[PDB]
């Protein structure tokens, strides 16, 4: 494609996990607003797709058209289920096709999560606390993360998350970050803070982690090794 | 998204902080194909300034364009002024006042830096270890970070820093992270790792924070060998 | 040279650091009554400087003060030019020129900083503790030291510093000192103190160090044998 770009935003793992609907959206920008702007979807093999449900009524430039999508199940996402968005308009001499396939993730690596509590220095400020859920040692990309508190998915306005960047050990490994701001007192009590990470490489695509003052480094050690010359069983 | 697209560039402070040299360059992606360019560099005061040079005639797009560098004084450029070049075109006067200068003013805040050590699980696995450097609560953006081991600047490949992102508390606040890989053996009784941070809203333009094995807290064991 | 000094001297590392703007002064006096006398700053490019200020006459020490000054950026000051100041006087129609320069070569070594905590006998008596930021094995000279607590610096009103002295067992290497005094309870609350060592021969021209009571806390044990 050279003239008149065509966007194509496939469904991310977040919607597959939370929304549970794989919708492939494709649109055309910087184009005229007349009729004949038909957006369709079909498989490269020749098979079509489900009806384009939940169309977009308004448009950025009031482009009179109908975005093409398909409420296909997750089965059309693994490796060998490609798609093609076809767009037709009177301005162009022929319709434009946009083919899309799966990245075909390779060199699967079980994510290795290593959480650690907030830095000591913040505690001296006594103004606010921040928690990290850095994730590393995983492949492929597209790892989702969320901050739960007793089964309360926190809103994105509360926690932020970063995309994954290549790891320095090898290019077949990525790492990402996700922070969440809270009050210092709330962190003091623990409040059953948990981090949920979803990745395809995981056997169940869900892994939960948690941290507390005890987890980091308890200075005290009230160790009591009872010699108990003779107990045999649990004395 | 509609023309005049600028490709991703490294406007970070390291552009001049690694080599300690003022560099001035401004261009637009996919420029109109024309012979030469109407170079023009002047300050906002009114007096002209030495124009850039060293035009490297090499592009992947094969589009006839020009790109170079200009070194200027530091007082004027860092005078709280967003220096913008004024390079125009031969076919038509098009002064591209692109702000290659960093955003001075707006709001200054100390970038709080915390240097956190690897988790117990990572070290116990005895395969590698990662040290984290969190930078939080600062303004404006574009805060640079680097690593050192007692004057031994480790290769950029070893560590990696995220580009700045906005903070959930408010847009003014930002935060960034820098991770460094290293073997566990050195983290036990090896060398100290220092995470230096550079920002315009700093007194010396740079700070530093070191960590080593004892970075935690002193353990106070209370063993009680109760016997018969 | 303070009294009778017809030369020009540049600001030192501390002056450039505090002002953040490299300058250069030319003092010429105690030779004859200097009234309404001109001053020029011939640089390598041969361009007189502007922005002249802080000029007064009728000095109480029986003379006339007409010290000239220039303000530039470090792009050229480090380049190692030969800046000159010229003064033509009535009794001396000949141009009284004074050229200066900077060292274009010298051995540079990282400043080995070591922050030593208060002595046990220094604070055992419930008195003002003292903290010393020893710095040694470094060169060239003129290292600026300033103390920083929490997130702000402290003026010499509270601390003091020494000048460089040559090293005893390290030719070509100098060392300095700097003490910050503190109250007893203030130190006992841990707090945060850090000596900042501005020196050119540094990876980034600036370093820092911190040592407080928590630093010297080796692993502790409390055994209890019971039988
Ligand atoms: C607060 C306190 O009393 N702690 C001690 C503890 O350190 C010790 O290990 C234990 C043995 O009897 O006795 C108790
Ligand atoms: C450092 C520490 O806690 N040492 C403990 C002490 O606290 C406790 O009183 C004693 C038994 O009376 O055993 C020992």
XYZ file of C-alpha atoms and ligand atoms in Angstrom:
718
model
C 0.000 0.000 0.000
C 1.366 3.386 -1.073
C -1.589 5.753 -1.516
C -4.312 6.358 1.075
C -3.209 4.570 4.241
C -5.404 1.943 5.908
C -5.278 1.434 9.671
C -5.594 -2.067 11.124
C -5.821 -2.454 14.910
C -6.374 -6.122 15.860
C -7.787 -7.139 19.253
C -5.200 -7.187 22.019
C -4.926 -9.876 24.683
C -6.563 -7.521 27.198
C -9.899 -7.564 25.363
C -9.560 -11.309 24.761
C -9.103 -11.767 28.525
C -11.492 -9.129 29.907
C -13.845 -8.268 27.042
C -13.615 -11.750 25.456
C -14.137 -10.671 21.858
C -11.602 -10.693 19.006
C -12.601 -7.734 16.807
C -10.312 -6.810 13.904
C -10.888 -3.119 13.151
C -9.705 -1.550 9.891
C -10.420 1.951 8.593
C -9.219 4.419 5.963
C -8.084 7.963 6.756
C -7.342 11.063 4.680
C -10.041 10.089 2.197
C -13.171 11.671 0.787
C -16.513 11.340 2.558
C -18.748 10.203 -0.307
C -20.574 6.871 -0.417
C -19.323 3.510 -1.771
C -16.923 3.276 1.207
C -17.486 -0.393 2.064
C -15.200 -2.115 4.580
C -15.291 -5.919 4.459
C -13.315 -8.744 6.046
C -12.423 -12.156 4.652
C -9.880 -14.912 5.130
C -6.980 -15.163 2.702
C -8.216 -18.691 1.953
C -11.504 -17.290 0.637
C -13.804 -17.807 3.600
C -15.586 -14.707 4.868
C -16.088 -13.672 8.509
C -19.013 -12.898 10.791
C -21.043 -9.725 10.401
C -19.401 -6.437 11.356
C -21.009 -5.865 14.758
C -20.828 -2.730 16.910
C -19.991 -0.371 14.063
C -18.659 3.141 14.641
C -21.389 5.741 14.130
C -19.360 8.944 14.370
C -16.093 9.465 12.501
C -13.109 11.797 13.005
C -13.721 13.602 9.706
C -17.396 12.578 9.396
C -16.346 10.023 6.774
C -19.564 8.363 5.613
C -18.522 4.709 5.820
C -18.839 1.589 7.977
C -15.831 0.152 9.791
C -15.311 -3.566 9.216
C -14.965 -5.968 12.129
C -15.873 -9.529 13.091
C -16.973 -11.031 16.412
C -14.913 -14.171 15.828
C -14.066 -16.441 18.744
C -10.517 -16.670 20.108
C -9.870 -19.764 17.971
C -9.063 -17.424 15.064
C -5.947 -16.080 16.775
C -3.460 -18.891 17.414
C -0.992 -19.091 14.516
C -2.751 -20.087 11.314
C -5.848 -17.873 11.173
C -5.110 -14.852 8.993
C -7.472 -12.103 7.859
C -7.834 -9.528 5.100
C -9.587 -6.154 5.173
C -10.934 -4.984 1.814
C -11.900 -1.358 1.197
C -13.574 0.060 -1.898
C -14.224 3.655 -2.901
C -15.002 5.549 -6.089
C -11.891 7.726 -5.744
C -9.584 4.708 -6.023
C -9.502 2.745 -9.295
C -9.641 -0.599 -7.484
C -10.259 -1.754 -3.906
C -7.353 -1.972 -1.472
C -6.635 -5.162 0.480
C -4.742 -5.387 3.779
C -3.631 -8.851 4.899
C -2.757 -9.621 8.517
C -1.446 -12.745 10.236
C -0.237 -13.756 13.674
C 3.357 -13.045 14.766
C 3.794 -16.796 15.367
C 5.516 -16.414 18.725
C 8.655 -18.512 19.089
C 11.041 -19.581 21.862
C 8.374 -19.720 24.538
C 9.693 -18.787 27.977
C 7.729 -19.160 31.186
C 7.464 -15.670 32.735
C 9.614 -15.307 35.855
C 8.186 -12.691 38.216
C 10.448 -11.224 40.910
C 8.602 -8.611 42.970
C 10.155 -6.536 45.738
C 8.661 -4.011 48.162
C 8.906 -0.226 47.817
C 12.252 1.374 48.545
C 13.075 2.239 52.142
C 13.673 5.896 51.281
C 10.006 6.515 50.454
C 9.081 5.538 54.015
C 11.128 8.470 55.322
C 9.204 10.895 53.105
C 5.930 9.718 54.672
C 3.800 11.343 51.963
C 2.877 8.463 49.642
C 3.924 4.948 48.673
C 4.406 3.277 45.306
C 4.487 -0.413 44.395
C 6.132 -2.161 41.453
C 5.214 -5.345 39.593
C 8.169 -5.561 37.225
C 8.055 -8.683 35.053
C 10.952 -10.240 33.167
C 12.174 -13.461 31.614
C 9.176 -14.079 29.374
C 8.406 -14.607 25.694
C 6.638 -13.749 23.456
C 5.327 -10.202 24.000
C 1.732 -9.185 24.751
C 1.748 -9.636 28.529
C -1.127 -8.057 30.454
C -0.886 -6.894 34.069
C -3.341 -5.560 36.642
C -3.359 -4.604 40.332
C -5.944 -6.389 42.483
C -6.896 -5.692 46.102
C -9.218 -8.373 47.485
C -10.698 -8.992 44.040
C -10.903 -5.300 43.113
C -9.379 -4.653 39.675
C -7.904 -1.184 40.098
C -8.640 1.397 37.427
C -5.910 2.489 34.979
C -6.016 5.977 36.514
C -4.594 4.453 39.717
C -1.891 2.173 38.290
C 0.271 2.674 35.208
C 1.983 0.037 33.075
C 4.750 0.091 30.477
C 5.203 -1.830 27.269
C 7.854 -4.571 27.219
C 11.318 -3.823 25.861
C 13.951 -6.326 24.705
C 15.981 -7.804 27.524
C 19.779 -7.436 27.435
C 20.468 -11.158 27.920
C 19.014 -12.105 24.524
C 16.440 -10.764 22.037
C 14.212 -13.779 22.704
C 13.289 -12.348 26.101
C 11.349 -9.213 27.048
C 10.654 -7.322 30.263
C 7.972 -4.837 31.318
C 7.068 -2.663 34.302
C 3.873 -1.672 36.091
C 3.657 0.779 38.991
C 0.793 1.735 41.295
C 0.604 4.771 43.579
C -1.130 4.553 46.959
C -0.890 6.200 50.370
C 1.936 5.224 52.707
C -0.480 4.108 55.429
C -2.348 1.831 53.018
C 0.948 0.144 52.153
C 1.775 -0.130 55.858
C -1.244 -2.382 56.449
C -0.650 -4.500 53.328
C -4.345 -4.487 52.378
C -3.955 -7.751 50.416
C -2.219 -6.060 47.496
C -1.761 -8.458 44.579
C -0.482 -8.270 41.008
C -2.093 -10.384 38.287
C -0.092 -11.102 35.133
C -1.562 -12.818 32.075
C 0.656 -14.287 29.371
C 0.026 -16.863 26.669
C 3.205 -18.762 27.563
C 1.762 -19.396 31.021
C -0.043 -22.740 31.372
C -3.203 -20.973 32.576
C -2.447 -17.401 31.411
C -2.932 -16.110 34.976
C -0.325 -15.692 37.712
C -0.794 -13.822 40.986
C 1.913 -12.377 43.220
C 1.861 -10.431 46.477
C 4.301 -8.718 48.823
C 4.279 -7.399 52.380
C 6.660 -6.070 55.016
C 7.351 -9.659 56.074
C 8.286 -10.696 52.534
C 11.070 -8.139 52.131
C 13.469 -8.394 55.062
C 12.416 -8.928 58.699
C 15.172 -7.449 60.846
C 14.044 -9.349 63.937
C 14.595 -13.113 64.110
C 12.958 -14.672 67.179
C 14.514 -18.019 66.298
C 13.837 -20.717 68.925
C 15.624 -24.008 68.234
C 14.348 -26.400 70.910
C 16.827 -29.251 71.291
C 14.334 -31.661 72.872
C 16.672 -34.588 73.574
C 13.772 -37.024 73.113
C 10.457 -36.280 71.417
C 10.190 -38.754 68.546
C 7.021 -37.087 67.279
C 6.023 -33.413 67.224
C 6.587 -32.423 70.859
C -0.825 12.096 11.481
C -1.565 14.501 8.609
C 1.738 15.237 6.866
C 4.701 17.040 8.488
C 5.478 13.778 10.290
C 8.611 13.708 12.453
C 10.192 10.307 13.003
C 11.283 9.259 16.476
C 14.528 10.943 17.538
C 16.688 10.946 20.705
C 16.166 14.486 22.068
C 17.543 13.315 25.427
C 20.249 15.164 27.345
C 22.768 12.387 26.646
C 22.908 13.721 23.078
C 25.217 16.389 24.546
C 26.044 14.832 27.930
C 27.967 11.782 26.705
C 30.379 13.761 24.504
C 29.896 17.209 26.106
C 29.300 18.978 22.792
C 26.444 21.200 21.664
C 24.672 19.630 18.685
C 22.038 21.418 16.592
C 20.163 19.598 13.827
C 16.612 19.930 12.515
C 14.894 18.195 9.605
C 11.527 16.860 8.457
C 10.890 13.322 7.256
C 10.523 12.869 3.497
C 11.517 16.407 2.512
C 10.724 17.767 -0.935
C 13.290 16.698 -3.523
C 15.398 19.737 -4.411
C 19.026 20.662 -5.000
C 20.684 22.067 -1.873
C 18.754 23.825 0.910
C 18.392 27.427 2.084
C 20.308 27.107 5.336
C 19.532 29.870 7.828
C 20.459 29.949 11.521
C 19.792 32.989 13.697
C 18.922 33.612 17.321
C 15.604 35.033 18.490
C 17.417 38.200 19.594
C 17.942 39.123 15.941
C 21.627 38.491 15.298
C 22.481 35.610 12.989
C 24.516 32.618 14.174
C 26.961 30.278 12.482
C 25.041 27.826 10.327
C 25.406 24.068 10.601
C 27.728 22.095 8.333
C 28.960 18.562 7.592
C 26.092 17.584 5.311
C 26.067 13.780 5.049
C 24.534 12.934 1.659
C 23.164 9.536 2.645
C 19.522 8.577 3.203
C 17.528 5.346 2.814
C 14.610 7.084 1.107
C 16.993 8.294 -1.637
C 15.392 11.741 -1.262
C 17.769 14.640 -1.860
C 17.977 16.337 1.536
C 20.567 17.731 3.949
C 21.412 17.090 7.598
C 24.254 18.363 9.746
C 25.229 19.671 13.159
C 25.915 23.063 14.706
C 27.756 23.783 17.952
C 26.829 27.005 19.749
C 27.634 28.675 23.045
C 26.093 27.211 26.186
C 25.091 30.392 28.033
C 22.740 31.623 25.301
C 21.268 28.225 24.403
C 20.753 27.341 28.090
C 19.440 30.854 28.841
C 15.919 29.572 29.468
C 15.288 29.778 25.718
C 13.868 26.973 23.577
C 16.314 27.502 20.722
C 14.712 26.844 17.330
C 16.501 26.763 13.991
C 15.277 28.733 10.978
C 16.323 26.593 8.007
C 14.217 27.335 4.920
C 13.759 25.782 1.478
C 15.035 26.958 -1.896
C 11.722 26.453 -3.716
C 9.707 28.367 -1.098
C 10.612 30.034 2.227
C 9.588 27.495 4.895
C 11.215 28.342 8.247
C 11.126 25.130 10.293
C 11.322 26.465 13.857
C 11.622 22.974 15.303
C 12.453 23.064 19.016
C 15.585 20.922 19.212
C 16.231 22.717 22.511
C 14.927 21.155 25.707
C 11.902 22.707 27.466
C 13.295 25.179 29.995
C 11.098 26.327 32.859
C 7.516 25.069 33.105
C 8.207 23.525 36.514
C 11.310 22.289 38.330
C 11.292 19.355 40.725
C 13.929 17.140 42.272
C 13.796 13.700 40.612
C 13.663 11.395 43.626
C 15.824 8.356 42.915
C 15.568 5.053 44.765
C 18.038 2.241 44.088
C 16.458 -1.138 44.876
C 18.288 -4.480 44.930
C 17.289 -7.775 43.300
C 14.703 -10.012 44.912
C 15.715 -12.919 47.132
C 14.369 -15.404 44.582
C 16.592 -14.008 41.826
C 19.786 -14.388 43.870
C 18.766 -17.787 45.258
C 18.246 -19.062 41.711
C 21.970 -18.274 41.275
C 21.704 -17.567 37.558
C 21.753 -13.756 37.459
C 20.539 -10.670 39.313
C 18.897 -7.378 38.374
C 19.239 -4.035 40.159
C 16.400 -1.539 39.727
C 16.673 2.260 39.691
C 13.380 4.114 40.082
C 13.170 7.829 39.252
C 9.966 9.543 40.340
C 8.360 12.900 40.966
C 10.027 15.383 38.635
C 9.386 18.063 36.032
C 9.962 18.800 33.213
C 10.498 15.552 31.287
C 13.657 14.231 29.602
C 15.570 12.962 32.644
C 18.700 10.998 31.744
C 20.141 8.066 33.706
C 23.398 6.095 33.643
C 25.285 3.402 35.557
C 28.802 3.256 36.956
C 30.941 0.845 38.978
C 33.464 2.989 40.861
C 34.313 5.102 37.840
C 33.798 2.099 35.548
C 30.982 3.125 33.175
C 29.361 -0.126 32.108
C 28.293 -0.600 28.511
C 24.792 0.600 27.560
C 24.029 -2.981 26.529
C 24.325 -4.070 30.172
C 21.638 -1.753 31.544
C 18.492 -0.267 30.022
C 16.259 2.689 30.906
C 12.648 3.330 29.956
C 11.731 6.562 28.239
C 9.797 8.964 30.482
C 6.112 8.358 31.095
C 3.436 10.473 32.784
C 2.433 9.758 36.356
C -1.077 8.691 37.409
C -1.215 11.331 40.154
C -0.973 14.187 37.631
C 0.524 14.980 34.198
C 3.201 17.207 35.733
C 4.697 14.287 37.640
C 6.649 11.674 35.678
C 8.616 8.524 36.409
C 11.121 6.194 34.773
C 13.033 2.999 35.483
C 16.506 1.668 34.768
C 17.420 -2.004 35.134
C 20.921 -3.472 35.227
C 21.834 -7.145 34.889
C 24.805 -8.610 36.759
C 26.017 -11.950 38.106
C 25.179 -12.826 41.706
C 28.818 -13.481 42.630
C 29.737 -9.803 42.335
C 26.526 -8.773 44.109
C 27.662 -10.746 47.165
C 31.212 -9.454 47.698
C 32.039 -7.882 44.344
C 31.798 -4.214 43.395
C 29.393 -1.380 44.190
C 26.833 -0.289 41.600
C 25.935 3.387 41.231
C 22.923 4.793 39.385
C 23.583 8.388 38.330
C 20.664 10.619 37.340
C 20.840 13.833 35.302
C 18.064 16.422 35.115
C 17.797 20.150 34.497
C 16.016 20.588 37.853
C 19.077 19.534 39.828
C 21.645 21.700 41.631
C 24.758 20.093 40.138
C 22.900 18.825 37.046
C 23.544 15.295 38.349
C 23.261 13.104 41.429
C 24.331 9.563 42.293
C 23.255 6.677 44.521
C 25.325 3.570 45.251
C 24.382 0.077 46.421
C 26.135 -3.161 47.346
C 25.474 -6.388 49.253
C 24.842 -4.643 52.596
C 22.316 -2.319 50.932
C 19.597 -3.845 53.107
C 19.434 -3.597 56.898
C 21.528 -5.207 59.648
C 19.998 -8.503 60.745
C 19.513 -8.981 64.501
C 19.346 -12.712 65.172
C 18.066 -13.928 68.558
C 18.938 -17.614 68.666
C 17.667 -19.608 71.664
C 19.055 -23.157 71.764
C 16.675 -24.486 74.411
C 17.974 -27.828 75.695
C 16.774 -30.506 78.100
C 48.658 38.302 45.139
C 46.121 40.690 46.687
C 47.882 44.050 47.119
C 49.661 45.501 44.084
C 48.708 43.034 41.344
C 48.742 44.340 37.773
C 47.678 41.103 36.069
C 44.551 39.139 35.173
C 43.312 36.015 36.966
C 40.330 33.793 36.088
C 37.688 32.610 38.556
C 38.435 29.248 40.128
C 36.340 26.078 39.940
C 34.217 27.134 42.923
C 33.486 30.546 41.389
C 32.553 29.128 37.981
C 30.421 26.500 39.722
C 28.521 28.925 41.965
C 28.043 31.548 39.251
C 27.710 28.833 36.576
C 29.135 31.397 34.134
C 32.852 31.426 33.388
C 34.314 34.922 33.659
C 37.744 36.530 33.934
C 39.005 39.539 35.899
C 41.926 41.874 35.159
C 43.194 43.923 38.092
C 45.533 46.840 37.398
C 46.190 49.491 40.043
C 48.595 50.965 42.620
C 50.736 52.335 39.763
C 49.258 55.826 39.349
C 46.028 57.755 39.824
C 43.568 56.045 37.457
C 40.526 58.218 36.703
C 38.264 57.817 33.662
C 40.675 55.191 32.325
C 39.641 52.789 29.577
C 39.549 48.989 29.753
C 39.518 46.471 26.909
C 39.314 42.674 26.641
C 41.154 41.504 23.519
C 40.263 37.839 23.050
C 41.830 35.346 20.638
C 39.340 36.426 17.967
C 40.215 40.021 18.872
C 36.824 41.214 20.091
C 36.361 43.453 23.111
C 33.921 42.133 25.707
C 30.880 44.014 26.996
C 28.686 43.992 30.112
C 31.094 45.845 32.392
C 29.970 46.385 35.983
C 31.195 46.801 39.557
C 33.549 49.732 38.940
C 34.281 52.378 41.580
C 37.003 54.895 42.426
C 38.480 56.667 45.458
C 39.807 53.518 47.096
C 40.435 53.878 50.861
C 43.904 52.310 50.452
C 45.311 55.369 48.636
C 44.725 54.245 45.047
C 42.200 53.995 42.202
C 40.391 50.736 41.466
C 39.513 50.073 37.829
C 39.369 46.271 37.698
C 37.966 45.005 34.413
C 35.935 41.856 33.893
C 34.528 39.653 31.131
C 31.756 37.056 30.973
C 31.741 34.214 28.436
C 30.691 30.572 28.218
C 32.896 27.542 28.745
C 32.894 26.489 25.076
C 35.957 28.693 24.510
C 37.361 29.062 28.039
C 38.258 25.363 28.138
C 39.525 25.619 24.550
C 42.615 27.319 25.982
C 42.766 30.746 24.349
C 44.996 33.652 25.444
C 42.639 36.326 26.718
C 44.263 39.713 27.223
C 43.191 42.905 28.982
C 44.541 46.237 27.737
C 44.491 49.557 29.598
C 45.899 52.768 28.109
C 46.534 55.442 30.739
C 47.384 59.126 30.500
C 50.808 58.785 32.135
C 51.309 55.602 30.066
C 50.132 56.275 26.500
C 51.688 52.922 25.653
C 49.102 50.114 25.837
C 49.324 48.272 29.164
C 48.421 44.757 28.067
C 48.158 41.675 30.280
C 47.717 38.296 28.591
C 46.511 35.170 30.390
C 46.184 31.515 29.443
C 45.168 28.142 30.846
C 47.088 24.858 31.204
C 46.591 22.780 28.058
C 48.068 19.626 29.605
C 48.193 18.048 33.065
C 47.733 14.645 34.686
C 44.161 14.054 35.873
C 43.124 11.535 38.524
C 39.767 10.620 39.992
C 39.170 12.232 43.404
C 39.147 9.464 46.001
C 36.451 10.594 48.415
C 35.976 9.021 51.847
C 33.426 10.269 54.376
C 34.495 9.486 57.934
C 31.862 9.485 60.698
C 32.088 11.161 64.110
C 34.442 9.574 66.607
C 33.019 7.711 69.588
C 34.812 10.064 71.987
C 33.576 13.026 69.913
C 29.907 12.484 70.819
C 30.048 10.233 73.896
C 30.084 13.437 75.971
C 26.780 14.635 74.447
C 28.401 17.363 72.373
C 28.453 18.699 68.819
C 29.581 15.860 66.569
C 31.866 16.500 63.602
C 31.866 14.931 60.133
C 34.930 14.956 57.868
C 34.802 14.510 54.082
C 38.362 13.462 53.376
C 39.302 13.653 49.702
C 42.680 12.572 48.372
C 44.579 11.041 45.485
C 43.359 13.661 43.036
C 44.672 16.340 40.696
C 44.802 19.032 39.455
C 43.996 21.242 42.447
C 41.045 23.529 43.208
C 38.405 20.980 44.206
C 35.218 22.588 45.506
C 33.528 20.823 48.423
C 30.056 21.628 49.694
C 27.838 19.780 52.140
C 24.278 18.764 51.275
C 21.587 17.553 53.668
C 18.276 16.010 52.665
C 18.098 17.861 49.351
C 19.674 21.291 49.866
C 23.239 22.561 50.326
C 24.741 24.280 53.357
C 26.769 27.483 53.330
C 30.181 27.820 55.015
C 28.381 29.460 57.944
C 27.942 25.881 59.198
C 30.921 24.026 57.672
C 34.553 24.730 56.820
C 36.993 23.448 54.204
C 40.750 23.339 53.724
C 42.793 24.078 50.661
C 44.771 21.407 48.802
C 48.058 20.202 50.239
C 50.486 17.935 48.374
C 50.256 14.241 49.134
C 52.937 12.765 51.418
C 53.480 9.530 49.485
C 51.987 10.446 46.104
C 53.915 12.977 43.984
C 51.689 15.046 41.727
C 48.638 14.159 43.838
C 46.877 16.481 46.281
C 44.278 16.092 49.013
C 41.929 18.337 50.968
C 39.608 18.275 53.963
C 36.226 19.573 55.034
C 34.387 19.489 58.364
C 30.702 19.950 59.096
C 29.708 20.376 62.736
C 26.374 19.136 64.057
C 24.402 18.992 67.272
C 24.257 15.779 69.273
C 20.532 15.041 69.018
C 20.546 16.128 65.364
C 23.127 13.471 64.497
C 21.465 10.900 66.766
C 18.299 11.116 64.631
C 20.265 9.653 61.710
C 19.396 12.370 59.200
C 21.237 12.608 55.864
C 24.534 14.369 55.124
C 26.592 14.169 51.926
C 29.741 15.984 50.833
C 29.700 16.971 47.154
C 33.102 17.126 45.465
C 33.125 19.282 42.327
C 36.312 18.457 40.417
C 37.148 18.472 36.724
C 38.914 15.081 36.806
C 35.666 13.205 37.374
C 33.613 10.967 35.070
C 30.885 13.634 35.040
C 32.763 16.444 36.868
C 30.640 15.887 40.014
C 30.384 13.126 42.612
C 28.954 12.610 46.085
C 29.024 10.310 49.092
C 26.930 9.536 52.161
C 27.729 7.899 55.496
C 25.440 7.972 58.541
C 25.081 5.913 61.705
C 23.310 3.075 59.889
C 26.410 2.565 57.732
C 28.601 1.152 60.498
C 26.162 -1.525 61.675
C 27.746 -4.960 61.205
C 25.622 -8.105 61.435
C 24.500 -8.649 65.030
C 23.844 -11.871 66.931
C 22.137 -12.582 70.248
C 22.668 -16.214 71.200
C 20.962 -17.774 74.227
C 21.997 -21.217 75.443
C 19.496 -22.798 77.838
C 19.911 -26.179 79.514
C 11.569 -8.680 72.640
C 12.229 -9.855 73.294
O 12.151 -10.055 74.502
N 12.906 -10.673 72.483
C 13.605 -11.858 72.952
C 14.209 -12.623 71.780
O 15.150 -11.793 71.109
C 14.885 -13.895 72.274
O 15.332 -14.670 71.167
C 13.905 -14.719 73.104
C 14.539 -15.937 73.734
O 13.984 -16.202 75.015
O 13.385 -13.924 74.180
C 12.673 -12.766 73.747
C 19.005 -8.732 71.933
C 17.964 -9.422 72.762
O 16.764 -9.255 72.571
N 18.421 -10.232 73.722
C 17.548 -10.976 74.615
C 16.914 -10.045 75.643
O 16.106 -9.082 74.975
C 16.066 -10.839 76.628
O 15.599 -9.984 77.665
C 16.888 -11.969 77.240
C 16.074 -12.876 78.134
O 15.705 -12.222 79.340
O 17.434 -12.794 76.200
C 18.311 -12.096 75.317
